[model samples]
Each structure stands twice: as structure tokens, then as C-alpha cells.
Target: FYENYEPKEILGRGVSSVVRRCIHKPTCKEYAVKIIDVTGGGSFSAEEVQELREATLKEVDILRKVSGHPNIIQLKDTYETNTFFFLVFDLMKKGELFDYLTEKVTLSEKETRKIMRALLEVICALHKLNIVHRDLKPENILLDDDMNIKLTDFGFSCQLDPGEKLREVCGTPSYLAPEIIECSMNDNHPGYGKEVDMWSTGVIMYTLLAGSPPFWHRKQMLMLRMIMSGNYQFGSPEWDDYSDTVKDLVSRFLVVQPQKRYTAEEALAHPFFQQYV
Candidate 1:
């Protein structure tokens, strides 16, 4: 892999993995290579290290299932060395959406619509395949050269059977759905499914346009309480120019009851996207 692709600058890093920008020798095209250490480096136990290898393979399987979508980050190939695993993926020129939001502070209605439409379209595709991206947040959201949406990071994603619900509580805190919070706090609570992704997207929608979180509060427990009850209101003049049409769409997704929340199809069909398109 090193001979075929020459590694360049570092793109991202973690405890056991590092993503590097590499150029293919033949085509000269650039790609991001995620290098995972299979040998645990003595810091981790033996069992945990092998689980890391399993995680690297499982991520490839999930990527194959989700490939070919324009809005998703593309995976190119996977290679293994005696000491490490190399996972190659398409590189996004514009970088992370979290950094973009930080620069712009807030986005206009039209730009927000573009991101939302692309997001909902791919999300609809993911749902149809019975896959759930349990973790969707600003950092996981990427931007292409033209600022098109490109979602990445599937380390926590999982699949479901037909009409199935997942019990595991896994997701970034600020983006978690109300039903997930319920199931996490109470052992007996029924599990959640795809609706959680919609809620996470709604949180993204609100933060992108508002430049802040809807349920963010001074206290962590207070914020969780607010999320539990679907408590939020638009103010601080950030929402002054937004039309009610867009607000209504986000409102439906943020509903505390998962059964009542908008599905991917329904969200794409919302009048805001329809009228804007």
C-alpha cells in the first residue's frame, strides 16, 4: 500500500488510529488512509486489541453496505500489514462541517436547505437498507469542495432486522434522541430505531442555522431534562429571518415521541424542501 500510495500530511488522529492524506502513485489522486495499530502497543490488553482489529473490519463491511451514495464518504480499499491495518477512503477537500460552522457562525436559509436536502436524501437511502447511523453530529458531517454534504465516521453504526428496534444506548450526547435517553435511564424501556437518526439530524439542522444548540443549558442535567420534554424556543434574533416553513420541518423532527417524529421520506417531502427545490 505504501508503494502504491505515498503518504503525506496527517488528516486526523485517535488513540489507536491515524488518518493520513496519500497520493496514488499511478493516478495521482488523493485519498485519506486510516491506519489502525493491530498490535495494541502494550497500553491495551490482548483481547481489547483484537477487538480493535474486528472493529476495523466491521467498519469496512458497513462502508461497503453504504457505498455509491454521493452524500456519503467513499471507501477505496483496505490493506493489512503484519503490524497495522490500512483503510483507504475518499478525502473531502473542504474538511469538517463543524469547522465550517465555526467560521460562518450561521448559514442562510437557502444554504441550510441544500445541506438538509442532501442529508435527508441519503438518510432515506440508509433507512431503506435497514442501517442506522446512530451517531450523526457536526464533526461526523463533512463538506466537499463545493460544500456538498458528505457524512463519515461509522465506528458506532449498526444494522437492524426488519421491524427491529435496538436497545444499546450509543451516540453523541447533544445529538441523542429523546427515546434513546429514555431507554438509557430505564432498563425496562423499549428500544429505539431509525427515528433516533431523524432527531439527531434535527439537532444538526437547528445548530447549523441558529449557531447554537436548541437544548443546551448551563447545567447538563437541565439540558437533558429539556430534551426529555422537547423544550426549546427560537429567540436571540438568530431566528428572526427564518420562515415558519423551515421551522415547522425541524419542529416535527425534534418531537419527543419517536412514533410521531418525521421519517426520512416525510422529512424530504416537507414543504420547506419541496418549495425550495
Candidate 2:
């Protein structure tokens, strides 16, 4: 199907799509094209295809609804060819923050602060639209030339009515909320809200300072046990320099109870961040 437009090198691949950096034959403009094969034999089953299609549509709608934000990626066009569905977005020169964070030398404090502030602004806008970005991690965040952050991937994002609740058990395990795991015991799980995103932000912040997650363990069961217990240890080399105020904020956001966790707005107002702001 890419032959209909123009062949270009592959940019990246998600669960069931291949993203390519391509040029429009007519306009000579570049776009990041995501091609998904609906019927092809691969990791995504038919049901998964339907889910992906719905996710793509939701992402497109949400992106349009939150359009004109400087920290959000811009969509160019979307269409389906004979063999695959194509979603075209603005060609981003800089790539995902995951690469930088995992590098030998990570971002400096000043650079990290700039990116974090930009991401927070985007998250604030998203929450205002009643959409919670269920997934908030370095991999889903991209950086531009100015070191600003643009969040990508809406596969796990969903809109909620005012005071509504959700029960979907999705998102990366490391970043999952405690309620998410506890919710498995009975259907009457405490429905998580936007505060779950704050928990993830806390996880991200911990990683930023420590260069690793606070609850990591080599054994999966042990990790799960620790997470379920909501107990995390701070090491000297990684957290000794951190102020008590910062530790307090992290503890509050990473609370086991979703309701007790700090909301993004509330976290922004906390002394740890507000002082810097």
C-alpha cells in the first residue's frame, strides 16, 4: 500500500503497525505514516484489530479535540489503501525520550525540567478535556529540538464523564496503579480515575532522579509483592540528595489508594514543584 504513496524507510513499529517516514508524492511534504494490516496474519488477532481500529479512531478524535496545543503532535491526514490503513502525522525530527533516558548519559536537570514542564502542560490540557492519558512513560513521550516534550500514543487513553469510573485493566505493569492489581480479586474494584495518572507521573519522577524505578526487583513475584504492599525504599546514591519535600511528594502520589493519590493539579501545586515553578 505504501507503493501507492511512496516507499520510505521504516520509522518504528507498534503492536500491529509499521510507521514510516514518507513523503507525499504530490505535495513533497514529509509525514510519519502508520500502516496497519487488518487481515494479515500477525501478533494482532481479529478482535485485537477491532480494538486497535477503535483506539486509532479515539486517538484521532482526541487529538483533534485537543488540537492547537504546542506540546501535542499534529495529525496531517488519514486514509486506507487497498491493503492497509494509514495514519499520517507531522514528521518529528526528534524521537522518543526513552532512547535518551536509557542512554549512558541521561538528560541534565535543566533539560529534564523543561521537558517535564511541557509534558505537564499537555497533561493539564488533556485532563481539562476529560481525557486521561492512561499511559504516561518516557517511551510515549517525544522530544523536539528545543528539548520540549510531545506525548504520543493513545492506545490506552480514554475519556470519562464527570465523576465517572472505569475498570479497564490495561497499561504497562511497571506503571500500573495498585488498584489495578487489587481490582482482580473482585469485580467491585475501586474504580480508578485521573489520579492514576499522577501515580504514573510519580513513577516517572522517581526514575528521573534515581535513573531507575524505586520498586524494581529481579523476581516478578517479589516485585508484585512489593508493589502490592506499596512499600518502596530510597537508596543513598540515588535519593540522598533529594529533599524531604520531594520525598513527601513522591510518597503522596504513589499511595496505594487511588483516592489518596495526588491529582495532577494538586501535585503541580505541591511545594516540591511549585517552588521550582
Candidate 3:
């Protein structure tokens, strides 16, 4: 049965795993297989093994529950041999949004809105299921030929029960919310929760239009100070072509205060996205 599979070139590599494109020799179906090498990083420690198992189970369970959604990554199959785990996922053709953004092509306003709508739907679905995709960076968002977005990489995802809060210090450095960073780096704040994901969504929206991140500056201290100080530059010449409605909406969600940030459902009702209704 397994004889029908033949692996092609490596798609990408992570700290403990490698993804490869594979073709099914019999059915002619294409798939992306993630080979997780638990032993690759000098063997897993007790805590590492426990964390890996927890994350893997969580990912498999969450993906299984959310499998039918068109915007979420589909898990085809998963199997484990003696040495490693193999996770087969649908082969995404367009790759990541990171490559596209870094290529320096400006997106039309229409294209940007379309992407935002699809991404918002995905976020709404996850929130409805009480699953928070803690890591929502451009690199984790994959696109298909039709420009549809698919969120991938659930290693940092977690299920937050109704009204429950989480304070884990995880996710990409750039997209993290102020409260999340405070809980991680500073000891003064009460940990963050679902609002952190909303903050990240705001950052993504800003970057999509500005062609760069809103809080990005060469100096690390200045960027951190700006993020914590709730100071963001808006309506610059670069964003002169963008709509003020969108800028206002992004700013509302990007607020440093978790209490002030828009929840996923509330963001759907914003005037900027009123066209979708």
C-alpha cells in the first residue's frame, strides 16, 4: 500500500522536522509529508518529549475537528514508525505569504481585502471552536493558486476553555501582542489570552497594506518601546493609497490593551469589512 508513495525534493525545514513534496505513484495524487525527527536535535529530553507529545496530539485532534473548512490546512493521514512520525497534508502550491511579501509586489486594494476576508473567516472558525492559533505569522499562512489562504503549523496552538486564560510565552517575535511579550519577558503583567491572536491579526492586516510591519524599526529597543508605549505611525505616504477605513479598523484591533482589542467576531462587524456582509 505504501509503495505508491515517492518523495520529491524537500519543501522546507524546521528545527526538528523536514517537509517534503511527495507524489502517489498509483493515484497520481500529490501530498506534502512532514517527517518529524525527534532524534535529530540530540534526542528529546523528558520535558521536550512530553511537550512534543502534547503538541502533536493537540494538532491532530484540532485539525481533525476542523478538517472540512476550506481555509484551514487538511491533514490527509498520520503514521508513526519506530523512529519518527509522518504527517501527510494537502500539497499547497502557492507556498507562503512571506515569499510573496518579500518579493516587493504591491497588492491592489481589492486583492488585499479578499485575502483579509478569507483569513478572518479562518480565524472566526478557530475561535468558535475555542482553539487559539497562537502563531499566526505570514510564514505560517499558505496560499493556493487562487490566492486563497490556508493557516498551517499548529505546534503552538491551544484550546482555551470559555473564559479561561493562558500565559505561555510562545509565537513569532514580530507578531506577538504586547501583553504576551510582557508575560513572557516581564514579570509584572497578568498573562494574556485569546486577545493575543486578535492583536496578531491586526499586525497582519497592517503589514499586508503597508508592505512592511507597522511596529518594525531597526532598533530593537525603539520597536519594543513603541509597542509598549502604544505609539504607532499611521497614514504615512506609503499607505496614502490605502483606505482610511481599513487603517482605522487595523488600529482598533492592534491596540496594546487586550481589553481594547477587537475579538474575532467583533472584527467581522467592523465597517471596513461591512462589504462582506
Candidate 4:
């Protein structure tokens, strides 16, 4: 399938993968191709090789399972060679939410509401499918030409059986939940569930309204300390303009206790979003 398409400029890069723009020779349609190098196993143990294979295939499996969601990026096709694996996805012309947010000093409540609602809807869909997007951040969210939300990057995502708990210390530090920080600090810590995603969502919502993270520190250790403390506040100026209803929603999501965090569905139904009902 890729033979019909000509690769263009490099779109992005990571440790073991590179994404590039490709145009179909026949229809001139554009797509993003993520090529992951899975070669170089000489130094790796057999078990390590197997783990790498599983990790590489995990994203493809997830994209297949969650395909057709309007708010999620669509995987067009995939192919693999002995040395590399290729994943084709719809090209996001408007780039990442990170870039969009960086330009706007702050978003109005009305603007934030629309974006958050779309994000919650996507999270609700993933939760319904028993998938937890372990990495939920502005960098992983893309916008189409219309500026609609398109959740991407399932590399760190995992499928959970009902009531299952995850112990992996994954995800961007600033968006991590207290439980995740605790788990990283002590392996003996009780594992977390889907609510971890909600916590990250809370961090995103907070940053959207305040133009900065709820918890922050120049040093990584201090940042982790702040997140684990769950002591973030809606202090003056930055948060002063927002309504109490919005603050209430953010408060519920950032709760240290996973059980106390609002589920995606419940969050959409919160008073803050009742205007759309």
C-alpha cells in the first residue's frame, strides 16, 4: 500500500521511531506514517526482544480497536518488515494542541468548555472500551483543519479487564496523579486504575484555564513532590476570572484519591456542562 505513496518531509521523531508525511501518487491524499525500527537485537536478551515486539504492536492493536471515533485519529493501514514497522494515520493539518495553546495566553471559559467537552467524550469512549490512555497531555492531542480535538499517540495506552489495576509509572510527570507518583516512589504502593487518566485530564483542564500547570517546580523531584501532595490551589489573577462551577469541576478531577475523581461521563454531566444539555 505504501508503494503508491511518496514520502515527503519528516514530520516528527522519537527515540526509535520517525513520522513523515506521505502523499498518494494516485489521489494526492496526504497521510502521516510512523516508522518504528525494531531491529538491533544482538545485545538484547530473548525476553527483551519479545517485550520490544509486544510494545511495538500494542499501539497498532489499540488503534484497530478504537477506530472510527471522530475525536480519535484514524489509522489507515500498517505494514512491517523484519527491520521496521509502519503505521499510517490521517494527517492532522492543524498540528498539536500544545502549539495551539502556546500561542493563546489563556482561553475563555466558553472556549475551554468546548475543548474539554470533546476531550471528555473521547475519554469516555476509551473507558467504555476498557482502554486507559496512560498518556494524556496537550502534546498528544492534535487538531484537524477545523480545530476539532483528535486524540493521538496510544504508545503508552493499555487495555484493562474490569476492575483491573495498573502499576506502571508511565505518562508525563506534570500530568501524573498522586497515586502514580506514589507508585514510582514505592513499588509496594497500591496500583491505580482508569482514574489516573481523569487526574491527567484535570491537570490539562487546569492548565487550559490558568495558562500554567496547577503544580510546578523547576526541579523534577520538587515537581513530583508537589503533584504527590495534591496541594494545588486556584490562587488569584490567573484563576480569579474563572467561575466557581469551572473550579469545582477541576477540583473533582484533581482529587488525590482515585475513587474520588470524576469519571469521564460524570464529568460531562457536571453542572459546568449542563448548559449544553
Each prediction's Cα lDDT score?
0.87, 0.74, 0.80, 0.88
Ranking of models by lDDT: 4, 1, 3, 2
Question: Could you tell me every candidate's TM-score relative to the true structure?
Answer: 0.92, 0.88, 0.92, 0.94
Q: Can you tell me which runs of candidate 4 are displaced by over 4 Å? A: 40-49
Candidate 2 vs 4: which has more TM-score: 4
Compared with the true structure, what per-residue lDDT tens digits does model 3 show for residues 93-185?
999887787785556567777877788888899988888889888888988888689998877888787788777787766788889767867
Mind giving the per-residue lDDT tens digits that candidate 1 earns over 151-263? 89877677788888888876667788989889989989888998999999999999989999888877878888899999988765888899999899889989999999999
Among residues 3 or more apart in sequence or in different chains, the pairs in candidate 1 whose N, CA or C atoms overlap within 3 Å are none
Candidate 2, superposed: residue stretches over 4 Å from native: 1-5, 40-46, 81-83, 104-108, 275-277
- Give the alpha carbon lDDT tens digit for every residue of 54-152 in model 2: 777787777777768898877677786444678787776778777778883444444555665677678888888889888998888877777567787
Which has the greatest TM-score?
Answer: 4
Runs with alpha carbons beyond 4 Å of true place in candidate 1: 38-43, 81-83
Report the candidate with higher lDDT, 2 versus 4. 4
- Over the full model, what C-alpha lDDT does candidate 4 score relative to the true structure? 0.88
Q: In candidate 1, what residue range of length 10 has the lowest lDDT sum?
A: 38-47
TM-score of structure candidate 1: 0.92
Selected candidate, larger lDDT, 1 vs 2: 1
